[PDB]
Amino acid sequence: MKVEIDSFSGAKIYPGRGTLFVRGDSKIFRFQNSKSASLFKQRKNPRRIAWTVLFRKHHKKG
């Protein structure tokens, strides 16, 4: 059992949960829910989405 961290939000993805995505250049992407996935299909930059980990590391939150 591995707990893989998300690609968009930084969330933790427990087994049997979420989805995986394979970009055609064979980089593998993992999504917790339909939220981070359906923002990934809008080509949103995760550094400007306020609730991801990448944002809250970008501005030293907490």
């Binding site: 933790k12 427990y14 087994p15 049997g16 949960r17 917790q32 829910n33 339909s34």
Partner: protein
């Protein structure tokens, strides 16, 4: 004319008529075949269905591709307070069926089976089983006469039990009364065991155990009056139809000049008796046993109740059976688990299973955290208390 494209039926003629059940509690039509060797034990049990959760276990199956490798599955957790015995009943085998000759009820019925007998508990004088409970003022010579008549007679012995609904987080307050056949040898020993267990608990660690195949009898989730297409799985018609598309187009031939029973019509869907066999128990969990949801690999203390509780049920604080796969009936229904009727040797059965990880995130959203301690570790401190 013949059909021109000879295709299967729709639906199943053996599940007819598709009408509403007799009750919300489904009759156990058939009990396991008895052997007069084993110690006295029950054949079935009464739980209340809570809801489902995800399980990660290790599939162990030689000849497969996933041998010794992790899989996920869905389990249903059915909630089980310990079920308390109140009476026994013997059946004499006639040439017209097993006619009940007597029944014997216990001394001090609780207020739940006293509530089963009234449609209106608040107005009633609550006087059920007063004059019957007067039969213990003597040594019980009437009562011992009754049990001696069962021992003299009575080929098969069923035991009246009832759930303890007051321990269940429902809002019903009124227990469900039921019969369960016994399997011990020498019917005198059966009714002696039932006499010894009047007003006594029966916990599921005694009837059921790990790895075992059980059946589940329950009443289907109901869906009202349903048309012929989602009820029977029939084709929709093409879009250009006048006067309704979602129908069965040809009912019958010209002859027989009546509509056959076998064609599909519109009507009730749901709320049927369904028996579903060969479900496998993964956990038998004890409520006094803290950390139901830990396992030998998991090792962090948590119960199986998800964060925020089971959706539309509550919190498991009782024993529970935790069984592979889907089960008939929706949440908060009286679900009757049964021992399997045939000894199954199938290598899907007889597999010693032990879990690895039990899901306990919320079922009320996309749950991201298993325990609130892990949410507090991940998310940090908030605007609230500190």
């Amino acid at each position: 004319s013949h059909r021109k494209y000879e295709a299967p039926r729709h639906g199943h003629l053996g599940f007819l008529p598709r009408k509403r059940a007799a009750s919300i509690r489904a009759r156990v039509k058939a009990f396991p075949k008895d052997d007069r060797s084993k110690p006295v034990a029950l054949t079935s049990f009464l739980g209340y269905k809570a809801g489902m959760t995800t399980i990660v276990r290790d599939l162990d199956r030689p000849g497969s591709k996933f041998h010794k490798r992790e899989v996920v599955e869905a389990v249903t957790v059915v909630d089980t307070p310990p079920v308390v015995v109140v009476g026994v009943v013997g059946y004499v085998e006639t040439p017209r069926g097993l006619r009940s000759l007597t029944t014997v009820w216990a001394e001090h019925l609780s207020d739940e089976v006293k509530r089963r007998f009234y449609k209106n508990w608040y107005k009633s004088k609550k006087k059920a089983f007063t004059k019957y409970s007067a039969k213990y003022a003597q040594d019980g010579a009437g009562i011992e006469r009754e049990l001696a008549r069962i021992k003299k007679y009575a080929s098969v012995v069923r035991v009246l039990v009832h759930t303890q609904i007051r321990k269940t987080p429902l809002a019903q307050k009124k227990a469900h009364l039921a019969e369960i056949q016994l399997n011990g040898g020498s019917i005198s020993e059966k009714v002696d065991w039932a006499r010894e267990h009047f007003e006594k608990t029966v916990a599921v660690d005694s009837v059921f155990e790990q790895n075992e195949m059980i059946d589940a009898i329950a009443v289907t989730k109901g869906h009202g009056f349903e048309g012929v297409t989602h009820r029977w799985g029939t084709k929709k018609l093409p879009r250009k139809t006048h006067r309704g598309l979602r129908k069965v187009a040809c009912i019958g031939a010209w002859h027989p000049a009546h509509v056959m029973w076998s064609v599909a019509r519109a009507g009730q869907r749901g709320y049927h008796s369904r028996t579903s066999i060969n479900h496998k128990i993964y956990r038998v969990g004890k409520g006094d046993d803290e950390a139901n949801g830990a396992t030998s690999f998991d090792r962090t203390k948590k119960t199986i109740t998800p964060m925020g509780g089971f959706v539309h049920y509550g919190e498991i604080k009782n024993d529970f059976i935790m069984v592979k796969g889907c089960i008939p009936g929706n949440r908060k229904r009286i679900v009757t688990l049964r021992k399997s009727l045939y000894t199954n040797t199938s290598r899907k059965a007889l597999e010693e299973v032990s879990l690895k990880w039990i899901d306990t995130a919320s079922k009320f959203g996309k749950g991201r955290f298993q325990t609130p301690a892990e949410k507090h570790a991940f998310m940090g401190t908030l605007k609230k208390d500190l």
